[PDB]
Design a protein around this motif. Structure first.
Motif, PDB file in Angstrom:
ATOM      1  N   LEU A  39      49.153  41.820  46.328  1.00  7.95           N
ATOM      2  CA  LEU A  39      48.374  43.080  46.339  1.00  7.95           C
ATOM      3  C   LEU A  39      46.856  42.827  46.337  1.00  7.95           C
ATOM      4  O   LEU A  39      46.123  43.455  47.117  1.00  7.95           O
ATOM      5  N   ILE A  40      46.345  41.995  45.417  1.00 10.13           N
ATOM      6  CA  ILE A  40      44.933  41.651  45.304  1.00 10.13           C
ATOM      7  C   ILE A  40      44.395  41.017  46.595  1.00 10.13           C
ATOM      8  O   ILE A  40      43.265  41.344  46.993  1.00 10.13           O
ATOM      9  N   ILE A  41      45.139  40.078  47.216  1.00 10.80           N
ATOM     10  CA  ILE A  41      44.616  39.304  48.351  1.00 10.80           C
ATOM     11  C   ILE A  41      44.472  40.193  49.581  1.00 10.80           C
ATOM     12  O   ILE A  41      43.541  39.958  50.397  1.00 10.80           O
ATOM     13  N   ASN A  42      45.403  41.119  49.743  1.00  8.49           N
ATOM     14  CA  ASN A  42      45.638  41.753  51.039  1.00  8.49           C
ATOM     15  C   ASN A  42      45.282  43.242  51.013  1.00  8.49           C
ATOM     16  O   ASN A  42      45.633  43.978  51.934  1.00  8.49           O
ATOM     17  N   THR A  43      44.552  43.695  49.989  1.00  6.49           N
ATOM     18  CA  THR A  43      44.127  45.090  49.930  1.00  6.49           C
ATOM     19  C   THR A  43      42.597  45.131  49.918  1.00  6.49           C
ATOM     20  O   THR A  43      41.951  44.380  49.196  1.00  6.49           O
ATOM     21  N   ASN A  47      34.684  47.067  45.100  1.00  9.86           N
ATOM     22  CA  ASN A  47      33.969  46.517  43.959  1.00  9.86           C
ATOM     23  C   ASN A  47      34.560  45.117  43.676  1.00  9.86           C
ATOM     24  O   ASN A  47      34.857  44.837  42.514  1.00  9.86           O
ATOM     25  N   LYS A  48      34.632  44.224  44.714  1.00  8.92           N
ATOM     26  CA  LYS A  48      35.256  42.891  44.490  1.00  8.92           C
ATOM     27  C   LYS A  48      34.408  42.046  43.527  1.00  8.92           C
ATOM     28  O   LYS A  48      34.908  41.047  42.966  1.00  8.92           O
ATOM     29  N   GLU A  49      33.122  42.429  43.306  1.00  9.67           N
ATOM     30  CA  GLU A  49      32.196  41.551  42.579  1.00  9.67           C
ATOM     31  C   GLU A  49      32.603  41.332  41.121  1.00  9.67           C
ATOM     32  O   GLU A  49      32.120  40.402  40.477  1.00  9.67           O
ATOM     33  N   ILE A  50      33.510  42.185  40.609  1.00 12.41           N
ATOM     34  CA  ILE A  50      33.922  42.052  39.230  1.00 12.41           C
ATOM     35  C   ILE A  50      34.715  40.756  38.967  1.00 12.41           C
ATOM     36  O   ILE A  50      34.976  40.465  37.791  1.00 12.41           O
ATOM     37  N   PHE A  51      35.123  39.983  39.992  1.00 10.56           N
ATOM     38  CA  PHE A  51      35.748  38.680  39.706  1.00 10.56           C
ATOM     39  C   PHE A  51      34.883  37.854  38.759  1.00 10.56           C
ATOM     40  O   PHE A  51      35.418  37.127  37.933  1.00 10.56           O
ATOM     41  N   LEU A  52      33.556  37.879  38.960  1.00 11.25           N
ATOM     42  CA  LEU A  52      32.780  36.926  38.192  1.00 11.25           C
ATOM     43  C   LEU A  52      32.749  37.345  36.724  1.00 11.25           C
ATOM     44  O   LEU A  52      32.754  36.493  35.864  1.00 11.25           O
ATOM     45  N   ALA A 128      48.980  51.674  38.555  1.00 15.97           N
ATOM     46  CA  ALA A 128      47.671  52.338  38.485  1.00 15.97           C
ATOM     47  C   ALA A 128      46.899  52.090  39.772  1.00 15.97           C
ATOM     48  O   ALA A 128      46.211  52.995  40.274  1.00 15.97           O
ATOM     49  N   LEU A 129      46.968  50.856  40.315  1.00 10.47           N
ATOM     50  CA  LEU A 129      46.340  50.550  41.611  1.00 10.47           C
ATOM     51  C   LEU A 129      46.956  51.364  42.746  1.00 10.47           C
ATOM     52  O   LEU A 129      46.207  51.895  43.591  1.00 10.47           O
ATOM     53  N   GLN A 130      48.282  51.543  42.719  1.00 11.46           N
ATOM     54  CA  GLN A 130      48.897  52.375  43.757  1.00 11.46           C
ATOM     55  C   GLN A 130      48.324  53.788  43.694  1.00 11.46           C
ATOM     56  O   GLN A 130      48.106  54.401  44.760  1.00 11.46           O
ATOM     57  N   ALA A 131      48.089  54.289  42.479  1.00 10.06           N
ATOM     58  CA  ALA A 131      47.629  55.653  42.247  1.00 10.06           C
ATOM     59  C   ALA A 131      46.106  55.787  42.478  1.00 10.06           C
ATOM     60  O   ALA A 131      45.520  56.852  42.230  1.00 10.06           O
ATOM     61  N   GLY A 132      45.439  54.672  42.850  1.00  8.45           N
ATOM     62  CA  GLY A 132      44.053  54.612  43.343  1.00  8.45           C
ATOM     63  C   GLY A 132      43.019  54.090  42.330  1.00  8.45           C
ATOM     64  O   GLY A 132      41.822  54.362  42.454  1.00  8.45           O
ATOM     65  N   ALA A 133      43.459  53.423  41.259  1.00 11.74           N
ATOM     66  CA  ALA A 133      42.530  52.936  40.219  1.00 11.74           C
ATOM     67  C   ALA A 133      41.538  51.945  40.830  1.00 11.74           C
ATOM     68  O   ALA A 133      41.832  51.228  41.783  1.00 11.74           O
ATOM     69  N   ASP A 134      40.368  51.809  40.176  1.00 19.20           N
ATOM     70  CA  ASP A 134      39.385  50.812  40.585  1.00 19.20           C
ATOM     71  C   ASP A 134      39.890  49.450  40.079  1.00 19.20           C
ATOM     72  O   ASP A 134      40.407  49.347  38.988  1.00 19.20           O
TER      73      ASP A 134
END
Ligand SMILES: Nc1ncnc2c1ncn2[C@@H]1O[C@H](COP(=O)(O)CP(=O)(O)O)[C@@H](O)[C@H]1O
Ligand SMILES: [Mg+2]
Ligand SMILES: [Mg+2]
Length: 233
Positions: A39-43, A47-52, A128-134
């Motif tokens: 899910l993470i890799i392919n969506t 706001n990807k910057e939160i990895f750090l 929660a991600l399916q339901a559109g969470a950040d």
């Protein structure tokens, strides 16, 4: 018997040290962790910057453990190493490395903490991600490490804990990871997370961008963080 006054480099080259063996083991991710990684890799997320933020918080937690482990083992007080984080972008190799001097992980800590055991929140987080969470809410669900795969195609973790030898964990996702004894450059106590960045995510090698996201999301580390910048040739 055969007089010489000067030798060529190849003639005085020293014999190699004996080749070392490194033991490698391969493990499957726990089912719901594998599903989360895909899910993470392919969506797309905005706001990807939160990895750090997630990796820095892991290092701050490992550094806090040094302080507290001294209450049951005072010998850590007599390390001279500074408790700190270093961020190391390499534009040549397209890698961003997060280095800390925290407690490190043993071999069994890498196997059990970084992929084979289920976090209780993983299924709720995917819903929660399916339901559109950040994607930012990842930390609250017990699975923040895997946010590395928002920006990296491969992750390598090199680590050394006082109670074990140095190990390397590695995964390119796809359902499995490896753990292998690491007989290369000793890194001393702590952990080094090496992100091999995706081609469209090279902004995270740039000094202004890195400073921007540390100031936005990681202002309460509690330890010094420095950013190493390679001099422009
Ligand atoms: N820099 C680091 N040093 C030591 N252990 C680390 C580490 N980064 C991750 N870990 C280990 O990996 C586990 C999983 O990290 P996550 O951020 O996914 C979940 P959390 O434990 O931080 O809530 C941590 O609990 C810790 O045992
Ligand atoms: Mg964490
Ligand atoms: Mg803290």
């Amino acid at each position: 018997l055969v007089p010489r006054g000067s030798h060529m480099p190849e003639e005085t080259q020293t014999q190699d040290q004996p080749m070392e063996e490194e033991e490698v083991e391969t493990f499957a991710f726990q089912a719901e962790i594998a599903q989360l990684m895909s899910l993470i890799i392919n969506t797309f997320y905005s706001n990807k910057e939160i990895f750090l933020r997630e990796l820095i918080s892991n290092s701050s937690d490992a550094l806090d453990k040094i302080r507290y482990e001294s209450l049951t083992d005072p010998s850590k007080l007599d390390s001279g190493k500074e408790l700190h984080i270093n961020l190391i972008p390499n534009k040549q190799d397209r890698t961003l490395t997060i280095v800390d001097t925290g407690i490190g992980m043993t071999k069994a800590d890498l196997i059990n903490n970084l992929g084979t055991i289920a976090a209780s929140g993983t299924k709720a987080f995917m819903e929660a991600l399916q339901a559109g969470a950040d994607i930012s809410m990842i930390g609250q669900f017990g699975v923040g490490f895997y946010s590395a795969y928002l920006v990296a195609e491969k992750v390598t973790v090199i680590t050394k804990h006082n109670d074990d030898e140095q190990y390397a964990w590695e995964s390119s996702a796809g359902g499995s990871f490896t753990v292998r004894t690491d007989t290369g450059e000793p890194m001393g106590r702590g952990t080094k997370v090496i992100l091999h960045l995706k081609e469209d995510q090279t902004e995270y090698l740039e000094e202004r961008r890195i400073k921007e996201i540390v100031k936005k999301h990681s202002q309460f580390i509690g330890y010094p963080i420095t950013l190493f910048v390679e001099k422009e040739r």
